[PDB]
Amino acid sequence: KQEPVAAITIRTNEGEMGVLAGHEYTVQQLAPGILEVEYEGGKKDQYVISGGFAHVNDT
Amino acid sequence: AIAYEVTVNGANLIGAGMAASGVGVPAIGVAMCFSSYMLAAARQPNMSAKLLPYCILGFALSEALALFTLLIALLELFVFS
Amino acid sequence: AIAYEVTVNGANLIGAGMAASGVGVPAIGVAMCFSSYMLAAARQPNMSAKLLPYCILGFALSEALALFTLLIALLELFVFS
Amino acid sequence: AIAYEVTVNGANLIGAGMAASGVGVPAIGVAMCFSSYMLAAARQPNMSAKLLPYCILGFALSEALALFTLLIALLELFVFS
Amino acid sequence: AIAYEVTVNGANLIGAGMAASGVGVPAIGVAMCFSSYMLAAARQPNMSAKLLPYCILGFALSEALALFTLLIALLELFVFS
Amino acid sequence: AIAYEVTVNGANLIGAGMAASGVGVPAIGVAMCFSSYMLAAARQPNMSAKLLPYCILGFALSEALALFTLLIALLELFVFS
Amino acid sequence: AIAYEVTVNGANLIGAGMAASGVGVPAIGVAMCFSSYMLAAARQPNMSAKLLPYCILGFALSEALALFTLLIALLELFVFS
Amino acid sequence: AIAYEVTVNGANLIGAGMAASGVGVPAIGVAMCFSSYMLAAARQPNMSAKLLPYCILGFALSEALALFTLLIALLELFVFS
Amino acid sequence: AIAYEVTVNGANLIGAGMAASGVGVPAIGVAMCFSSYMLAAARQPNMSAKLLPYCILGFALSEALALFTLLIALLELFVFS
Amino acid sequence: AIAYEVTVNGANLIGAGMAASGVGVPAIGVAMCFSSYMLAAARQPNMSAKLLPYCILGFALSEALALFTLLIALLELFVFS
Amino acid sequence: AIAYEVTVNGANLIGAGMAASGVGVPAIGVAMCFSSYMLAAARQPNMSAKLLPYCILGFALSEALALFTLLIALLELFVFS
């Protein structure tokens, strides 16, 4: 819930995407697979997912 | 052998046509430089201010080659006989 | 060597037909500007008012080379002997 | 040098064949403008009416250079000797 | 100088091939007009009819340039000596 | 002034190849139209039927200019000496 | 005027290379046709069978103009002396 | 009229390099073919194997046109005197 | 065979425009280098810095070729007779 | 008629530049072959390893023409007087 | 026939402007590679390291041909009479 994070890498139907702060406003599906996350401390967190919808914002 | 030195004054204007033919090619980069800005500000209004100097940069440095082509057009004629 | 000065008058009108070929080349870049303007206006119609100033500029400056490319053909005949 | 003036009347007719070749290259910009109007309507149908004056404007000014290019090849022949 | 009028009669036929090179160029715009109509129709079948007007107008006033170029390529031949 | 009428038999066959350059340019517009039909079927296969007439039609409209550019090529040789 | 008919045997061959410039242009429409079929089946493999007919039809119809582009040179050389 | 039969042996070679100019044109269809297969693979790894034959088909049938475009120049020099 | 050496001063001013016609082409890549950066900025503004070294790198080298393309036109005249 | 055979040593070089014009065109095929491998690799890094075979080949065969195009110009001079 | 061996020194310089037309074309493939790396970097910043080898490499192999495209232009003047 509203954690500060440095970066995130999704898997979608069109392909594999990555996101940073102030990425372009977009919304899209999530392919059934893995999701990578990278905090500001250099560590990582992987989550297996079952579909979904990513909602990225310009803010 | 036999030596002939020929000076074709009609060549004073034949190169200018081919030079003028390429004057309009950099235009292809002008709108392409502007188009990316139009989409960019659409995709992100917040960044429209920071991208405009680079549209001006690539625009002027694209139009410079047409400038020097027109310079060739002027130099081919107004100094040569 | 023998010295032959030759002057081809027919070339006064050839290079105008060569420079004419480049007058249609800015057309694709002139159309490209409005072509991308429609896409950015569709992505964010509220930016259309913000975008048409950044659209007419290159639209003229892409068309401007055509004038520079077309004036040559106009300048090539009515002044040359 | 010895002075040979040569007036080539066939040169009056060849150059138009080049200007005529410049009449095709603006057509792609016309199709680019209407292709943009179609994709924009597919992106924003209700916007199609407010984007139409810019489609007609890019159509007209894209056709303008084609018109001058077409004008030259005819102005090359029926007046020149 | 010595005055040499030279009338080149094979030049009646060379230039017609030059224009003939350009007669194919509007073809690349033809499908550009229909392709968007295809994709926009696939993107929005409800707008299939409302863009067919500019689907025909983009071909008509694009093929008109090809027709003019072809009218030059034939006009250049069947009258000029 | 002096008057030399020159009739060139070789000009029968050179400009013919100048026409052949315009014969390949419609092929890209044809494949563009087929590609548009393909991607249209990729987006909406049920709309493949309503869109196929626009593909069968636009192909022939692209191929007509290829036929004309070929017509000038073949008409340039078998009649002109 | 004085009448000179010239028969140029080198004109037998120059235009051949001109047509040769256009022999590779259809290959881009070929690659565009196969590229379109690739991405189409990449979006709809089930429909790949119903798109293969137009994937080979576009190859045939591009090869037809490629063969004509070669036909003009082959007719320009193998018979004309 | 007077009949001047001229044989231009340098025309053996001038058409050669013109034929060479179209030798690089197929390379764009080549790289477009492998590019499209690359994107179709990324879009769908499972369909990588089905699209490979169609990815070699236009690749080598474009090389057939490139081979002929080089064969013209190779057959132009060392057989014609 | 009779040996005839000829020196053409007309060709000093002709190749200049021949090289000038190619000076327009790198300008497209210039905007192509900027255009990507623009979208790359809007897609990920944090990468705006990381891609600016790649922008000037792709830009200057493009213009470097244009300089070379321009350089020949400069070298063709002010030293050659 | 009269038989005038001519050997043009200048024609040993005229076609060379046109062959050289085709030398830079396959360079697009290089980047077009590499750029896809970049983008698809970004879309699926885990698959990039098995996409490299399609990157080396399209470049390699793109160079096959590029060298053969560079072959003739190099062959155009040193064997032909 | 009557054998006129002719050596045209003007042809020493004409091709210099011809090959220059080929110098500008690889410049677009430079930005075609840099735009590739740019978009792939915005696609996945962490993959920026793995695609960088193919960027400069893809540029070099393009610029290399430009050098050869430039090499003849420098080999055309500094040695040939």
mmCIF file with all atom_site columns, N, CA and C in Angstrom, chain D residues 28, chain E residues 24-33 35, chain F residues 21-36 58-59 62-63 65-66, chain G residues 22-34 36 58-59 61-66 69, chain H residues 25 28-29 32, chain J residues 32:
data_model
loop_
_atom_site.group_PDB
_atom_site.id
_atom_site.type_symbol
_atom_site.label_atom_id
_atom_site.label_alt_id
_atom_site.label_comp_id
_atom_site.label_asym_id
_atom_site.label_entity_id
_atom_site.label_seq_id
_atom_site.pdbx_PDB_ins_code
_atom_site.Cartn_x
_atom_site.Cartn_y
_atom_site.Cartn_z
_atom_site.occupancy
_atom_site.B_iso_or_equiv
_atom_site.pdbx_formal_charge
_atom_site.auth_seq_id
_atom_site.auth_comp_id
_atom_site.auth_asym_id
_atom_site.auth_atom_id
_atom_site.pdbx_PDB_model_num
ATOM 1   N N  . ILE D 1 28 ? 1.699  11.056  -51.837 1.00 0.00 ? 28 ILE D N  1
ATOM 2   C CA . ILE D 1 28 ? 1.885  10.316  -50.596 1.00 0.00 ? 28 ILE D CA 1
ATOM 3   C C  . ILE D 1 28 ? 1.544  11.180  -49.391 1.00 0.00 ? 28 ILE D C  1
ATOM 4   N N  . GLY E 1 24 ? 4.300  5.936   -61.338 1.00 0.00 ? 24 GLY E N  1
ATOM 5   C CA . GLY E 1 24 ? 4.080  4.913   -60.332 1.00 0.00 ? 24 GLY E CA 1
ATOM 6   C C  . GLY E 1 24 ? 4.075  5.414   -58.905 1.00 0.00 ? 24 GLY E C  1
ATOM 7   N N  . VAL E 1 25 ? 4.600  6.608   -58.658 1.00 0.00 ? 25 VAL E N  1
ATOM 8   C CA . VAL E 1 25 ? 4.782  7.096   -57.293 1.00 0.00 ? 25 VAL E CA 1
ATOM 9   C C  . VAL E 1 25 ? 3.451  7.319   -56.575 1.00 0.00 ? 25 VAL E C  1
ATOM 10  N N  . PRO E 1 26 ? 2.415  7.888   -57.203 1.00 0.00 ? 26 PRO E N  1
ATOM 11  C CA . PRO E 1 26 ? 1.134  8.020   -56.486 1.00 0.00 ? 26 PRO E CA 1
ATOM 12  C C  . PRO E 1 26 ? 0.536  6.700   -56.048 1.00 0.00 ? 26 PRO E C  1
ATOM 13  N N  . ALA E 1 27 ? 0.977  5.583   -56.629 1.00 0.00 ? 27 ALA E N  1
ATOM 14  C CA . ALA E 1 27 ? 0.457  4.284   -56.232 1.00 0.00 ? 27 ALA E CA 1
ATOM 15  C C  . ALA E 1 27 ? 0.740  4.013   -54.765 1.00 0.00 ? 27 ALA E C  1
ATOM 16  N N  . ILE E 1 28 ? 1.902  4.454   -54.266 1.00 0.00 ? 28 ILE E N  1
ATOM 17  C CA . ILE E 1 28 ? 2.195  4.176   -52.861 1.00 0.00 ? 28 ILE E CA 1
ATOM 18  C C  . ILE E 1 28 ? 1.237  4.939   -51.956 1.00 0.00 ? 28 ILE E C  1
ATOM 19  N N  . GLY E 1 29 ? 0.684  6.058   -52.433 1.00 0.00 ? 29 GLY E N  1
ATOM 20  C CA . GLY E 1 29 ? -0.334 6.742   -51.662 1.00 0.00 ? 29 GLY E CA 1
ATOM 21  C C  . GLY E 1 29 ? -1.707 6.114   -51.750 1.00 0.00 ? 29 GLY E C  1
ATOM 22  N N  . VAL E 1 30 ? -1.973 5.343   -52.807 1.00 0.00 ? 30 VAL E N  1
ATOM 23  C CA . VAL E 1 30 ? -3.320 4.813   -53.012 1.00 0.00 ? 30 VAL E CA 1
ATOM 24  C C  . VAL E 1 30 ? -3.683 3.877   -51.872 1.00 0.00 ? 30 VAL E C  1
ATOM 25  N N  . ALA E 1 31 ? -2.848 2.870   -51.639 1.00 0.00 ? 31 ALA E N  1
ATOM 26  C CA . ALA E 1 31 ? -3.122 1.964   -50.538 1.00 0.00 ? 31 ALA E CA 1
ATOM 27  C C  . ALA E 1 31 ? -3.023 2.683   -49.205 1.00 0.00 ? 31 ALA E C  1
ATOM 28  N N  . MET E 1 32 ? -2.186 3.727   -49.122 1.00 0.00 ? 32 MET E N  1
ATOM 29  C CA . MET E 1 32 ? -2.118 4.512   -47.893 1.00 0.00 ? 32 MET E CA 1
ATOM 30  C C  . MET E 1 32 ? -3.474 5.108   -47.558 1.00 0.00 ? 32 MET E C  1
ATOM 31  N N  . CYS E 1 33 ? -4.274 5.423   -48.575 1.00 0.00 ? 33 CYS E N  1
ATOM 32  C CA . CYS E 1 33 ? -5.613 5.925   -48.313 1.00 0.00 ? 33 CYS E CA 1
ATOM 33  C C  . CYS E 1 33 ? -6.536 4.799   -47.872 1.00 0.00 ? 33 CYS E C  1
ATOM 34  N N  . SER E 1 35 ? -5.596 1.678   -46.710 1.00 0.00 ? 35 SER E N  1
ATOM 35  C CA . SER E 1 35 ? -5.101 0.922   -45.568 1.00 0.00 ? 35 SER E CA 1
ATOM 36  C C  . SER E 1 35 ? -5.633 1.487   -44.266 1.00 0.00 ? 35 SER E C  1
ATOM 37  N N  . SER F 1 21 ? 11.835 2.203   -64.171 1.00 0.00 ? 21 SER F N  1
ATOM 38  C CA . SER F 1 21 ? 12.012 2.581   -62.775 1.00 0.00 ? 21 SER F CA 1
ATOM 39  C C  . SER F 1 21 ? 10.668 2.799   -62.097 1.00 0.00 ? 21 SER F C  1
ATOM 40  N N  . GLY F 1 22 ? 9.706  3.359   -62.824 1.00 0.00 ? 22 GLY F N  1
ATOM 41  C CA . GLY F 1 22 ? 8.378  3.550   -62.285 1.00 0.00 ? 22 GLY F CA 1
ATOM 42  C C  . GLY F 1 22 ? 7.518  2.312   -62.225 1.00 0.00 ? 22 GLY F C  1
ATOM 43  N N  . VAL F 1 23 ? 8.033  1.154   -62.644 1.00 0.00 ? 23 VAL F N  1
ATOM 44  C CA . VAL F 1 23 ? 7.222  -0.060  -62.666 1.00 0.00 ? 23 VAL F CA 1
ATOM 45  C C  . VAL F 1 23 ? 7.235  -0.819  -61.341 1.00 0.00 ? 23 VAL F C  1
ATOM 46  N N  . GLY F 1 24 ? 8.264  -0.646  -60.516 1.00 0.00 ? 24 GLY F N  1
ATOM 47  C CA . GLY F 1 24 ? 8.328  -1.334  -59.240 1.00 0.00 ? 24 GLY F CA 1
ATOM 48  C C  . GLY F 1 24 ? 7.662  -0.589  -58.103 1.00 0.00 ? 24 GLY F C  1
ATOM 49  N N  . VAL F 1 25 ? 7.541  0.733   -58.251 1.00 0.00 ? 25 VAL F N  1
ATOM 50  C CA . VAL F 1 25 ? 6.994  1.555   -57.167 1.00 0.00 ? 25 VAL F CA 1
ATOM 51  C C  . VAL F 1 25 ? 5.567  1.177   -56.790 1.00 0.00 ? 25 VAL F C  1
ATOM 52  N N  . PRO F 1 26 ? 4.686  0.765   -57.707 1.00 0.00 ? 26 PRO F N  1
ATOM 53  C CA . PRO F 1 26 ? 3.361  0.300   -57.260 1.00 0.00 ? 26 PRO F CA 1
ATOM 54  C C  . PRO F 1 26 ? 3.386  -1.003  -56.473 1.00 0.00 ? 26 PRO F C  1
ATOM 55  N N  . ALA F 1 27 ? 4.433  -1.821  -56.607 1.00 0.00 ? 27 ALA F N  1
ATOM 56  C CA . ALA F 1 27 ? 4.464  -3.102  -55.907 1.00 0.00 ? 27 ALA F CA 1
ATOM 57  C C  . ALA F 1 27 ? 4.457  -2.914  -54.397 1.00 0.00 ? 27 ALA F C  1
ATOM 58  N N  . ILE F 1 28 ? 5.125  -1.866  -53.911 1.00 0.00 ? 28 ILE F N  1
ATOM 59  C CA . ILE F 1 28 ? 5.109  -1.605  -52.477 1.00 0.00 ? 28 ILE F CA 1
ATOM 60  C C  . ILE F 1 28 ? 3.739  -1.128  -52.026 1.00 0.00 ? 28 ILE F C  1
ATOM 61  N N  . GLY F 1 29 ? 2.998  -0.409  -52.873 1.00 0.00 ? 29 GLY F N  1
ATOM 62  C CA . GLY F 1 29 ? 1.666  0.003   -52.465 1.00 0.00 ? 29 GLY F CA 1
ATOM 63  C C  . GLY F 1 29 ? 0.690  -1.153  -52.497 1.00 0.00 ? 29 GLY F C  1
ATOM 64  N N  . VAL F 1 30 ? 0.944  -2.129  -53.365 1.00 0.00 ? 30 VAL F N  1
ATOM 65  C CA . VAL F 1 30 ? 0.105  -3.318  -53.407 1.00 0.00 ? 30 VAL F CA 1
ATOM 66  C C  . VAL F 1 30 ? 0.328  -4.138  -52.146 1.00 0.00 ? 30 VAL F C  1
ATOM 67  N N  . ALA F 1 31 ? 1.593  -4.424  -51.840 1.00 0.00 ? 31 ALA F N  1
ATOM 68  C CA . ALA F 1 31 ? 1.893  -5.157  -50.619 1.00 0.00 ? 31 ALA F CA 1
ATOM 69  C C  . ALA F 1 31 ? 1.465  -4.383  -49.381 1.00 0.00 ? 31 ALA F C  1
ATOM 70  N N  . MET F 1 32 ? 1.488  -3.049  -49.431 1.00 0.00 ? 32 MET F N  1
ATOM 71  C CA . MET F 1 32 ? 0.952  -2.251  -48.335 1.00 0.00 ? 32 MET F CA 1
ATOM 72  C C  . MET F 1 32 ? -0.544 -2.474  -48.172 1.00 0.00 ? 32 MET F C  1
ATOM 73  N N  . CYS F 1 33 ? -1.262 -2.621  -49.285 1.00 0.00 ? 33 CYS F N  1
ATOM 74  C CA . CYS F 1 33 ? -2.703 -2.818  -49.191 1.00 0.00 ? 33 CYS F CA 1
ATOM 75  C C  . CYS F 1 33 ? -3.015 -4.205  -48.648 1.00 0.00 ? 33 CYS F C  1
ATOM 76  N N  . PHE F 1 34 ? -2.290 -5.213  -49.129 1.00 0.00 ? 34 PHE F N  1
ATOM 77  C CA . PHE F 1 34 ? -2.465 -6.559  -48.597 1.00 0.00 ? 34 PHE F CA 1
ATOM 78  C C  . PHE F 1 34 ? -2.094 -6.612  -47.120 1.00 0.00 ? 34 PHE F C  1
ATOM 79  N N  . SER F 1 35 ? -1.024 -5.919  -46.730 1.00 0.00 ? 35 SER F N  1
ATOM 80  C CA . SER F 1 35 ? -0.629 -5.871  -45.329 1.00 0.00 ? 35 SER F CA 1
ATOM 81  C C  . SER F 1 35 ? -1.706 -5.212  -44.481 1.00 0.00 ? 35 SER F C  1
ATOM 82  N N  . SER F 1 36 ? -2.370 -4.197  -45.034 1.00 0.00 ? 36 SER F N  1
ATOM 83  C CA . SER F 1 36 ? -3.440 -3.540  -44.303 1.00 0.00 ? 36 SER F CA 1
ATOM 84  C C  . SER F 1 36 ? -4.618 -4.481  -44.126 1.00 0.00 ? 36 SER F C  1
ATOM 85  N N  . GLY F 1 58 ? -8.443 -1.849  -54.281 1.00 0.00 ? 58 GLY F N  1
ATOM 86  C CA . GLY F 1 58 ? -7.295 -0.972  -54.208 1.00 0.00 ? 58 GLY F CA 1
ATOM 87  C C  . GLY F 1 58 ? -6.059 -1.589  -54.814 1.00 0.00 ? 58 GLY F C  1
ATOM 88  N N  . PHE F 1 59 ? -5.999 -2.922  -54.878 1.00 0.00 ? 59 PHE F N  1
ATOM 89  C CA . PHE F 1 59 ? -4.877 -3.550  -55.557 1.00 0.00 ? 59 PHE F CA 1
ATOM 90  C C  . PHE F 1 59 ? -4.900 -3.193  -57.033 1.00 0.00 ? 59 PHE F C  1
ATOM 91  N N  . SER F 1 62 ? -3.843 0.278   -57.637 1.00 0.00 ? 62 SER F N  1
ATOM 92  C CA . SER F 1 62 ? -2.392 0.443   -57.578 1.00 0.00 ? 62 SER F CA 1
ATOM 93  C C  . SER F 1 62 ? -1.717 -0.146  -58.815 1.00 0.00 ? 62 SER F C  1
ATOM 94  N N  . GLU F 1 63 ? -2.231 -1.273  -59.308 1.00 0.00 ? 63 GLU F N  1
ATOM 95  C CA . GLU F 1 63 ? -1.647 -1.974  -60.447 1.00 0.00 ? 63 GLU F CA 1
ATOM 96  C C  . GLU F 1 63 ? -1.926 -1.271  -61.768 1.00 0.00 ? 63 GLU F C  1
ATOM 97  N N  . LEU F 1 65 ? -1.509 1.938   -62.440 1.00 0.00 ? 65 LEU F N  1
ATOM 98  C CA . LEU F 1 65 ? -0.373 2.805   -62.726 1.00 0.00 ? 65 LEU F CA 1
ATOM 99  C C  . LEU F 1 65 ? 0.846  2.006   -63.168 1.00 0.00 ? 65 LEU F C  1
ATOM 100 N N  . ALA F 1 66 ? 1.022  0.795   -62.633 1.00 0.00 ? 66 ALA F N  1
ATOM 101 C CA . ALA F 1 66 ? 2.083  -0.077  -63.123 1.00 0.00 ? 66 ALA F CA 1
ATOM 102 C C  . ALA F 1 66 ? 1.840  -0.451  -64.576 1.00 0.00 ? 66 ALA F C  1
ATOM 103 N N  . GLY G 1 22 ? 15.297 -0.731  -60.882 1.00 0.00 ? 22 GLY G N  1
ATOM 104 C CA . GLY G 1 22 ? 13.990 -1.019  -60.334 1.00 0.00 ? 22 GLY G CA 1
ATOM 105 C C  . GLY G 1 22 ? 13.692 -2.472  -60.056 1.00 0.00 ? 22 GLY G C  1
ATOM 106 N N  . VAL G 1 23 ? 14.638 -3.376  -60.313 1.00 0.00 ? 23 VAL G N  1
ATOM 107 C CA . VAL G 1 23 ? 14.363 -4.799  -60.148 1.00 0.00 ? 23 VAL G CA 1
ATOM 108 C C  . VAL G 1 23 ? 14.247 -5.174  -58.676 1.00 0.00 ? 23 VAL G C  1
ATOM 109 N N  . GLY G 1 24 ? 14.983 -4.494  -57.798 1.00 0.00 ? 24 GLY G N  1
ATOM 110 C CA . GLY G 1 24 ? 14.945 -4.786  -56.377 1.00 0.00 ? 24 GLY G CA 1
ATOM 111 C C  . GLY G 1 24 ? 13.854 -4.097  -55.596 1.00 0.00 ? 24 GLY G C  1
ATOM 112 N N  . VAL G 1 25 ? 13.190 -3.109  -56.196 1.00 0.00 ? 25 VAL G N  1
ATOM 113 C CA . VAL G 1 25 ? 12.143 -2.376  -55.479 1.00 0.00 ? 25 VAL G CA 1
ATOM 114 C C  . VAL G 1 25 ? 10.977 -3.276  -55.092 1.00 0.00 ? 25 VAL G C  1
ATOM 115 N N  . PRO G 1 26 ? 10.482 -4.177  -55.946 1.00 0.00 ? 26 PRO G N  1
ATOM 116 C CA . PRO G 1 26 ? 9.423  -5.097  -55.495 1.00 0.00 ? 26 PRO G CA 1
ATOM 117 C C  . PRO G 1 26 ? 9.806  -5.969  -54.311 1.00 0.00 ? 26 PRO G C  1
ATOM 118 N N  . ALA G 1 27 ? 11.094 -6.252  -54.112 1.00 0.00 ? 27 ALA G N  1
ATOM 119 C CA . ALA G 1 27 ? 11.497 -7.107  -53.000 1.00 0.00 ? 27 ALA G CA 1
ATOM 120 C C  . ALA G 1 27 ? 11.125 -6.504  -51.652 1.00 0.00 ? 27 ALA G C  1
ATOM 121 N N  . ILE G 1 28 ? 11.043 -5.177  -51.573 1.00 0.00 ? 28 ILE G N  1
ATOM 122 C CA . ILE G 1 28 ? 10.558 -4.539  -50.355 1.00 0.00 ? 28 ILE G CA 1
ATOM 123 C C  . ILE G 1 28 ? 9.071  -4.790  -50.158 1.00 0.00 ? 28 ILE G C  1
ATOM 124 N N  . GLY G 1 29 ? 8.271  -4.741  -51.225 1.00 0.00 ? 29 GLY G N  1
ATOM 125 C CA . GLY G 1 29 ? 6.879  -5.132  -51.074 1.00 0.00 ? 29 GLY G CA 1
ATOM 126 C C  . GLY G 1 29 ? 6.725  -6.602  -50.741 1.00 0.00 ? 29 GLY G C  1
ATOM 127 N N  . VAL G 1 30 ? 7.695  -7.416  -51.141 1.00 0.00 ? 30 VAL G N  1
ATOM 128 C CA . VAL G 1 30 ? 7.674  -8.829  -50.779 1.00 0.00 ? 30 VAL G CA 1
ATOM 129 C C  . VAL G 1 30 ? 7.902  -8.980  -49.283 1.00 0.00 ? 30 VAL G C  1
ATOM 130 N N  . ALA G 1 31 ? 8.972  -8.365  -48.788 1.00 0.00 ? 31 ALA G N  1
ATOM 131 C CA . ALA G 1 31 ? 9.273  -8.439  -47.369 1.00 0.00 ? 31 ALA G CA 1
ATOM 132 C C  . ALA G 1 31 ? 8.186  -7.788  -46.529 1.00 0.00 ? 31 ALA G C  1
ATOM 133 N N  . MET G 1 32 ? 7.579  -6.703  -47.018 1.00 0.00 ? 32 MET G N  1
ATOM 134 C CA . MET G 1 32 ? 6.444  -6.118  -46.315 1.00 0.00 ? 32 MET G CA 1
ATOM 135 C C  . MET G 1 32 ? 5.244  -7.055  -46.284 1.00 0.00 ? 32 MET G C  1
ATOM 136 N N  . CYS G 1 33 ? 5.056  -7.861  -47.329 1.00 0.00 ? 33 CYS G N  1
ATOM 137 C CA . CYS G 1 33 ? 3.917  -8.770  -47.343 1.00 0.00 ? 33 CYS G CA 1
ATOM 138 C C  . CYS G 1 33 ? 4.144  -9.914  -46.370 1.00 0.00 ? 33 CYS G C  1
ATOM 139 N N  . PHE G 1 34 ? 5.371  -10.419 -46.326 1.00 0.00 ? 34 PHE G N  1
ATOM 140 C CA . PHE G 1 34 ? 5.646  -11.534 -45.437 1.00 0.00 ? 34 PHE G CA 1
ATOM 141 C C  . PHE G 1 34 ? 5.745  -11.044 -44.003 1.00 0.00 ? 34 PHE G C  1
ATOM 142 N N  . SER G 1 36 ? 3.937  -8.599  -42.825 1.00 0.00 ? 36 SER G N  1
ATOM 143 C CA . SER G 1 36 ? 2.559  -8.413  -42.403 1.00 0.00 ? 36 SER G CA 1
ATOM 144 C C  . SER G 1 36 ? 1.941  -9.743  -42.015 1.00 0.00 ? 36 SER G C  1
ATOM 145 N N  . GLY G 1 58 ? 0.204  -11.680 -52.583 1.00 0.00 ? 58 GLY G N  1
ATOM 146 C CA . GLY G 1 58 ? 1.009  -10.476 -52.651 1.00 0.00 ? 58 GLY G CA 1
ATOM 147 C C  . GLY G 1 58 ? 2.410  -10.742 -53.156 1.00 0.00 ? 58 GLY G C  1
ATOM 148 N N  . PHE G 1 59 ? 2.945  -11.929 -52.867 1.00 0.00 ? 59 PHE G N  1
ATOM 149 C CA . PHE G 1 59 ? 4.244  -12.294 -53.414 1.00 0.00 ? 59 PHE G CA 1
ATOM 150 C C  . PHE G 1 59 ? 4.171  -12.465 -54.921 1.00 0.00 ? 59 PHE G C  1
ATOM 151 N N  . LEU G 1 61 ? 1.906  -11.147 -57.042 1.00 0.00 ? 61 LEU G N  1
ATOM 152 C CA . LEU G 1 61 ? 1.637  -9.866  -57.678 1.00 0.00 ? 61 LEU G CA 1
ATOM 153 C C  . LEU G 1 61 ? 2.800  -8.884  -57.574 1.00 0.00 ? 61 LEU G C  1
ATOM 154 N N  . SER G 1 62 ? 3.686  -9.029  -56.581 1.00 0.00 ? 62 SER G N  1
ATOM 155 C CA . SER G 1 62 ? 4.916  -8.240  -56.580 1.00 0.00 ? 62 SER G CA 1
ATOM 156 C C  . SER G 1 62 ? 5.935  -8.814  -57.557 1.00 0.00 ? 62 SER G C  1
ATOM 157 N N  . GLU G 1 63 ? 5.996  -10.142 -57.651 1.00 0.00 ? 63 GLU G N  1
ATOM 158 C CA . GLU G 1 63 ? 6.944  -10.769 -58.556 1.00 0.00 ? 63 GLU G CA 1
ATOM 159 C C  . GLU G 1 63 ? 6.566  -10.497 -59.998 1.00 0.00 ? 63 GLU G C  1
ATOM 160 N N  . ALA G 1 64 ? 5.281  -10.272 -60.269 1.00 0.00 ? 64 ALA G N  1
ATOM 161 C CA . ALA G 1 64 ? 4.858  -9.979  -61.633 1.00 0.00 ? 64 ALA G CA 1
ATOM 162 C C  . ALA G 1 64 ? 5.501  -8.690  -62.130 1.00 0.00 ? 64 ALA G C  1
ATOM 163 N N  . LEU G 1 65 ? 5.479  -7.644  -61.301 1.00 0.00 ? 65 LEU G N  1
ATOM 164 C CA . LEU G 1 65 ? 6.125  -6.398  -61.687 1.00 0.00 ? 65 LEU G CA 1
ATOM 165 C C  . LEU G 1 65 ? 7.639  -6.485  -61.589 1.00 0.00 ? 65 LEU G C  1
ATOM 166 N N  . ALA G 1 66 ? 8.170  -7.356  -60.729 1.00 0.00 ? 66 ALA G N  1
ATOM 167 C CA . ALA G 1 66 ? 9.615  -7.564  -60.732 1.00 0.00 ? 66 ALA G CA 1
ATOM 168 C C  . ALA G 1 66 ? 10.059 -8.211  -62.037 1.00 0.00 ? 66 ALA G C  1
ATOM 169 N N  . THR G 1 69 ? 9.924  -5.630  -64.755 1.00 0.00 ? 69 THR G N  1
ATOM 170 C CA . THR G 1 69 ? 11.095 -4.765  -64.649 1.00 0.00 ? 69 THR G CA 1
ATOM 171 C C  . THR G 1 69 ? 12.335 -5.436  -65.216 1.00 0.00 ? 69 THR G C  1
ATOM 172 N N  . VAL H 1 25 ? 19.105 -2.189  -52.937 1.00 0.00 ? 25 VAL H N  1
ATOM 173 C CA . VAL H 1 25 ? 17.694 -1.969  -52.612 1.00 0.00 ? 25 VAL H CA 1
ATOM 174 C C  . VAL H 1 25 ? 17.061 -3.180  -51.935 1.00 0.00 ? 25 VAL H C  1
ATOM 175 N N  . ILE H 1 28 ? 16.999 -3.822  -47.745 1.00 0.00 ? 28 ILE H N  1
ATOM 176 C CA . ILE H 1 28 ? 15.992 -3.335  -46.813 1.00 0.00 ? 28 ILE H CA 1
ATOM 177 C C  . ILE H 1 28 ? 14.859 -4.341  -46.669 1.00 0.00 ? 28 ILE H C  1
ATOM 178 N N  . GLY H 1 29 ? 14.439 -4.976  -47.765 1.00 0.00 ? 29 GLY H N  1
ATOM 179 C CA . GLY H 1 29 ? 13.475 -6.057  -47.632 1.00 0.00 ? 29 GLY H CA 1
ATOM 180 C C  . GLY H 1 29 ? 14.025 -7.227  -46.844 1.00 0.00 ? 29 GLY H C  1
ATOM 181 N N  . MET H 1 32 ? 14.013 -6.066  -43.171 1.00 0.00 ? 32 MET H N  1
ATOM 182 C CA . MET H 1 32 ? 12.616 -5.993  -42.763 1.00 0.00 ? 32 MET H CA 1
ATOM 183 C C  . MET H 1 32 ? 12.049 -7.379  -42.522 1.00 0.00 ? 32 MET H C  1
ATOM 184 N N  . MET J 1 32 ? 18.320 -1.672  -39.624 1.00 0.00 ? 32 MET J N  1
ATOM 185 C CA . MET J 1 32 ? 17.003 -2.292  -39.587 1.00 0.00 ? 32 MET J CA 1
ATOM 186 C C  . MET J 1 32 ? 17.103 -3.726  -39.105 1.00 0.00 ? 32 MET J C  1
#
